[PDB]
Amino acid sequence: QAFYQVSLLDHGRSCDDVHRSRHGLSLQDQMVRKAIYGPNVISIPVKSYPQLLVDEALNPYYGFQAFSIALWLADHYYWYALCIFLISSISICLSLYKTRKQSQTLRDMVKLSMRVCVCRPGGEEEWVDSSELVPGDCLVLPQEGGLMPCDAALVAGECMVNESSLTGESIPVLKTALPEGLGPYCAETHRRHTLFCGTLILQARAYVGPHVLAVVTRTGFCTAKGGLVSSILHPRPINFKFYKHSMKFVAALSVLALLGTIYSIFILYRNRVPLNEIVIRALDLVTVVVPPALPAAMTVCTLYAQSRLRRQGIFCIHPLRINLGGKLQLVCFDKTGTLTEDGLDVMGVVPLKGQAFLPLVPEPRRLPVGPLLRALATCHALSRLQDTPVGDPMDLKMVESTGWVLEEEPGTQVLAVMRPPLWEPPPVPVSVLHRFPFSSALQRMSVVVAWPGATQPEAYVKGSPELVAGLCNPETVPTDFAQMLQSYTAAGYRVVALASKPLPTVPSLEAAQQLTRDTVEGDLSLLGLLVMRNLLKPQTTPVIQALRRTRIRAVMVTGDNLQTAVTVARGCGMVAPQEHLIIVHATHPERGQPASLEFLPMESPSRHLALSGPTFGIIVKHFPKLLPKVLVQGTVFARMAPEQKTELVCELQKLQYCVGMCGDGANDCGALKAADVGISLSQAEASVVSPFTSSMASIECVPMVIREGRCSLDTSFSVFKYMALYSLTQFISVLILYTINTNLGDLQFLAIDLVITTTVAVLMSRTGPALVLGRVRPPGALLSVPVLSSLLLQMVLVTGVQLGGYFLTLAQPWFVPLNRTVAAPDNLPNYENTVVFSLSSFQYLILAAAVSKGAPFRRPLYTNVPFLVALALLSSVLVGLVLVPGLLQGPLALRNITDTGFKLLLLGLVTLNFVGAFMLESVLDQCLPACLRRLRPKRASKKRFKQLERELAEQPWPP
Numbered sequence: 001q002a003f004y005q006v007s008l009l010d011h012g013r014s015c016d017d018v019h020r021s022r023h024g025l026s027l028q029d030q031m032v033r034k035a036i037y038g039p040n041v042i043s044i045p046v047k048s049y050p051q052l053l054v055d056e057a058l059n060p061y062y063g064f065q066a067f068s069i070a071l072w073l074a075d076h077y078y079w080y081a082l083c084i085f086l087i088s089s090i091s092i093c094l095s096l097y098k099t100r101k102q103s104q105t106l107r108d109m110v111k112l113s114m115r116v117c118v119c120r121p122g123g124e125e126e127w128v129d130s131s132e133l134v135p136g137d138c139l140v141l142p143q144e145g146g147l148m149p150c151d152a153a154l155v156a157g158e159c160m161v162n163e164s165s166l167t168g169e170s171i172p173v174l175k176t177a178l179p180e181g182l183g184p185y186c187a188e189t190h191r192r193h194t195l196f197c198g199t200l201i202l203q204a205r206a207y208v209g210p211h212v213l214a215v216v217t218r219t220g221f222c223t224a225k226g227g228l229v230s231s232i233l234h235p236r237p238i239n240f241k242f243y244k245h246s247m248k249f250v251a252a253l254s255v256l257a258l259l260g261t262i263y264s265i266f267i268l269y270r271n272r273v274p275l276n277e278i279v280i281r282a283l284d285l286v287t288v289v290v291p292p293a294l295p296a297a298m299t300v301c302t303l304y305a306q307s308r309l310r311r312q313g314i315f316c317i318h319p320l321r322i323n324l325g326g327k328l329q330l331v332c333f334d335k336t337g338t339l340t341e342d343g344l345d346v347m348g349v350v351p352l353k354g355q356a357f358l359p360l361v362p363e364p365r366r367l368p369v370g371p372l373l374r375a376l377a378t379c380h381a382l383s384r385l386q387d388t389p390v391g392d393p394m395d396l397k398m399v400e401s402t403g404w405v406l407e408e409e410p411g412t413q414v415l416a417v418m419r420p421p422l423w424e425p426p427p428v429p430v431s432v433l434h435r436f437p438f439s440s441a442l443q444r445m446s447v448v449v450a451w452p453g454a455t456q457p458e459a460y461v462k463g464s465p466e467l468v469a470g471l472c473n474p475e476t477v478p479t480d481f482a483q484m485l486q487s488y489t490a491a492g493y494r495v496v497a498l499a500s501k502p503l504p505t506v507p508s509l510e511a512a513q514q515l516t517r518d519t520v521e522g523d524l525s526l527l528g529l530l531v532m533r534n535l536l537k538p539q540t541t542p543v544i545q546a547l548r549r550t551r552i553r554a555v556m557v558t559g560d561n562l563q564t565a566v567t568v569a570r571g572c573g574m575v576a577p578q579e580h581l582i583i584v585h586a587t588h589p590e591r592g593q594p595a596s597l598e599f600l601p602m603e604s605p606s607r608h609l610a611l612s613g614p615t616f617g618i619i620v621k622h623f624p625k626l627l628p629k630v631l632v633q634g635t636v637f638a639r640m641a642p643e644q645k646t647e648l649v650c651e652l653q654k655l656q657y658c659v660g661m662c663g664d665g666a667n668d669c670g671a672l673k674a675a676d677v678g679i680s681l682s683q684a685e686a687s688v689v690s691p692f693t694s695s696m697a698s699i700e701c702v703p704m705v706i707r708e709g710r711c712s713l714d715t716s717f718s719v720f721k722y723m724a725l726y727s728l729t730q731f732i733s734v735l736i737l738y739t740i741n742t743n744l745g746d747l748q749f750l751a752i753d754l755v756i757t758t759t760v761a762v763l764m765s766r767t768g769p770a771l772v773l774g775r776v777r778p779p780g781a782l783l784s785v786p787v788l789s790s791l792l793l794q795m796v797l798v799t800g801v802q803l804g805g806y807f808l809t810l811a812q813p814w815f816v817p818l819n820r821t822v823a824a825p826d827n828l829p830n831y832e833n834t835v836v837f838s839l840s841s842f843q844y845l846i847l848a849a850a851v852s853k854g855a856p857f858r859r860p861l862y863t864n865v866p867f868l869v870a871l872a873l874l875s876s877v878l879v880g881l882v883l884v885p886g887l888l889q890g891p892l893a894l895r896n897i898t899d900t901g902f903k904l905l906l907l908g909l910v911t912l913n914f915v916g917a918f919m920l921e922s923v924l925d926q927c928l929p930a931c932l933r934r935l936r937p938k939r940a941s942k943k944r945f946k947q948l949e950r951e952l953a954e955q956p957w958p959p
């Protein structure tokens, strides 16, 4: 009767229900469920070519150009129509290629199919089906190096999986068996028992089970790998798109087009040409005003920039966003693997005798056998790859520091057995009973471990110092724990605290392993603090100094302790030594206490604010009026959960800041997607994780993403402004002829539009970006006073030389007057056509050189090379033709002029116009300040960030 969403069908499923779904029906249920859900295939439509063309041809311009071709054919200027078709043909081919390439990349990612082993309710079938996989299907996963087709909760056993594409996470991720329960929660809601579509399985092992077996949850390409590709198809728009502002500027040109048309009507009525004939002249005037090569030129800008970035390594999707790059005002960054260096030496461990802390051991090897050694060795979730161990750089560096070595493949629920170094001045090899994974939000990991001693099993928890110390029973927790940790965090050593609890369970029993994560991480005794050292990436310190110099503010958003983040921030130059940092702190509103905000300064040898994640939580919920003041003044947001990073992005965006994100981790995945320009620095090739994936592991990417964006925005504005200048230059030329004896050209028009303008337009879009990122932001409105001024003033100079030419031509003593008695197509030679075309031809080229204006955002024009050769070549051909048309006289329909003097006068006028155009654009750059000061002495931006800044300047936060 009424359709129900697949999510709505399977939203309330119990923990038990996922186990109920396991060993699902072989065929009848499969078929009906598969029919209801639909086939498990990516929904990218496949088009041979002509299938695309019909859809592609529906664009409104294409209709107008088709009408124009017919109109020009009716006028019998076949040649101009021959060009007008050909330029549209180039436009459609390039648009087709652009569209085809954009789909092809996405389609190539999702073009994967492989034979799958599927479990029957009383069966275990092998390689039976893949694309037809049942929505609730249970399958046995491959042993090693196996891509997972569907998002499936793991019912039994443990899996090691590479999720690099899905989460931006290169490091191997542990997967564990789901626990059946009366409560219903989704596998995604667990966010760990689920195995995600399109993720490689490094290894798969069942300690107790015969093999690893998983039950499919959300599937059919509409979730995970496809859910994100599906996002890339029909993508989210950008608000207040600059094309609207250009469309307003087109209306200013529309007034000129109407004014021209009425001028023509009066001239034609005065001329007394047939009314039927005058309509064709009016129609030609309107069609000429439309530029044929603009629609192609807009595509070629983007395609060249994608080309420029692909070579730099910054692999891009949604190429429209490259311009958005140009406008970004703040760039958010992450601490570890981006601002700092991935991989960290263990700078020893600190042990505690009783309540008191003992002095730090430089090398973890030289320590007594007991809890801390075992915890340091066993806490990690490292697995053994072919002749090697694979894990998180921190956990890997820790175990190598201990000197204990992981045992290989060769009880029941016993895994990752840890072999001792077997050097003595007890070896007691130790085996893990239960593994708990590490979640960024959760901020800790835990293990249950047993030994041949066969005592009560001991649970070891390695986590963030504050949370672990808080979780520990306050018996062992030292009085000065905070102050002692403050030494290590202030130094800039990433610190993880280890806590041990003796657990009263039966050792080496599978059943005994089953336990509540909270119950294992409940009552705890603080054991020691690890002192990991992460060092700043060499290039980070430079890029941040440039981004601060441009006045694009850099905010730091991190899950690590506030003092370490402050040390990294003070190091990079987020906060310079001259600048002052305030630590906003908040007390929770609860019992008899209301919410309290306390601001305490920090002093080290622009009023920068550093806020812990929890303080920001209280500020957003219980101080909404203050949030604008802190988010426009906050530089080092720290101890932030993955969800909190998205909130900073969203609140900074609602304040009208254009955000950017350059994180390299699973924690940032949310923030990267939400942010305007999102960059994932550790990924290889194109990925769905971020809009602007990089393959360089540095912040050196971020300047390049801005620098190219500003170039693309200036190229878009230059190509638009040159296309307007050409059309008005054509309008003036065709009109000067329309008044004067009702004449035009055919082969001449093909030559100008097809060779002079289309070649220059495509070739002017490959100049490339400026060397250094600049203070001045690229101009963002096409309908601006400088742009409008520049175009209008230049067209006056175009007309001046053009009219001057005609006056000089008529004034020439040898000059023979025209006919003004026969139709424009019939009068194949006209003495005026020769002069007007010959003067105008060169000026069409000159406009591009003046328009280029390559300095703040783009490199000098000469550096282009293919443009510069074409400009010179076409100029040389035109110089050659104007001096001696020879053979080309006949095709050009040129009236041969023997006199050298008038040709030199004509060359002089073009040179004068050229000098004029260059002088006018240089004058325009110099004149802007005087104009701006007089037009507006002072102004206030509607955007909230610029006002809140100005308010804070007038009255600061309480000092």
Ligand SMILES: Nc1ncnc2c1ncn2[C@@H]1O[C@H](COP(=O)(O)OP(=O)(O)O)[C@@H](O)[C@H]1O
Pocket (backbone or CB within 6 Å): 335, 336, 392, 394, 395, 438, 440, 441, 443, 444, 445, 462, 463, 464, 465, 495, 496, 558, 559, 560, 561, 640, 667
């Ligand atoms: N493998 C781990 N097991 C337990 N705790 C960890 C582990 N790695 C990091 N931590 C701690 O938990 C915090 C949360 O990490 P995360 O949010 O991913 O940020 P980051 O890794 O940048 O510090 C870390 O800052 C650190 O204190």
Ligand SMILES: *[C@@H]1O[C@H](CO)[C@@H](O)[C@H](O)[C@H]1NC(C)=O
Pocket (backbone or CB within 6 Å): 818, 819, 820, 821, 822
């Ligand atoms: C110009 O063209 C006309 C055709 O109308 C023809 O008589 C002769 O070639 C020239 N003379 C005049 C009448 O303008």
Ligand code: ALF
Pocket (backbone or CB within 6 Å): 334, 335, 336, 337, 557, 558, 559, 560, 665, 667, 668
């Ligand atoms: F490594 Al982070 F936020 F600093 F993920």
Ligand SMILES: [Mg+2]
Pocket (backbone or CB within 6 Å): 334, 336, 337, 664, 665, 666, 667
């Ligand atoms: Mg990270």
